[PDB]
């Protein structure tokens, strides 16, 4: 069956956006860093390692606003033991109606792919925001590219995208704009 249950009713009329975690909303690593926004303990073979996470600039405004405009869904190739705690700490407003991790992606030709057909939404009303064009090779027409992010504290790409999404949120068919 599909990955998502039916949209709950205030969301039925909304475009579903699939949003990626790593290098899109945050950048994490095992290398300590003093200014991590989050530190997450992750157990790998019985040893607890520390993951240090930085928030992309304007991520908070981004999610708050996207959370009103869309049925927002987290889709990541990372494992839940990492992504779930990050999503918990990052998503103060409940933008994310659902979360999907590595086991929900399709492993194909090397890559973990976000197969949008598997969501169970109408694809004319689906978008994927993802920094890696490999993630949506099955549906590149549903995509809003976004540059990879690592630590540039001058980044404004999440602020700067909101106007595009505001107008996207209104249309009947996303292909009408991304062709």
């Amino acid at each position: 069956q599909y990955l998502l249950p039916e949209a709950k009713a205030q969301d039925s009329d909304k475009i579903c956006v699939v949003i990626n975690l790593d290098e899109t909303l945050v950048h994490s690593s095992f290398k300590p860093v003093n200014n991590a926004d989050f530190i997450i303990p992750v157990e790998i073979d019985g040893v607890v390692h520390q993951v240090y996470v930085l928030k992309r600039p304007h991520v908070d405004e981004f999610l708050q606003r996207m959370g009103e405009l869309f049925e927002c869904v987290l889709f990541t190739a990372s494992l839940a033991k990492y992504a779930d705690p990050v999503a918990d700490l990052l998503d103060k407003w409940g933008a994310f109606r659902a979360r999907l991790f590595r086991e929900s992606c399709v492993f194909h030709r090397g890559n973990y792919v976000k197969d949008l057909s598997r969501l169970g939404r109408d694809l004319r009303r689906v978008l994927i925001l993802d920094n890696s064009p490999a993630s949506y090779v099955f549906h590149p027409d549903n995509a809003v590219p976004v540059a990879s992010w690592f630590d540039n504290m001058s980044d404004t790409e999440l602020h700067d995208l909101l106007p595009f999404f505001e107008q996207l949120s209104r249309v009947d068919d996303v292909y009408s704009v991304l062709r």
Partner: peptide, 4 residues
């Protein structure tokens, strides 16, 4: 990795 557990990350992406």
């Amino acid at each position: 990795s557990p990350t992406x």
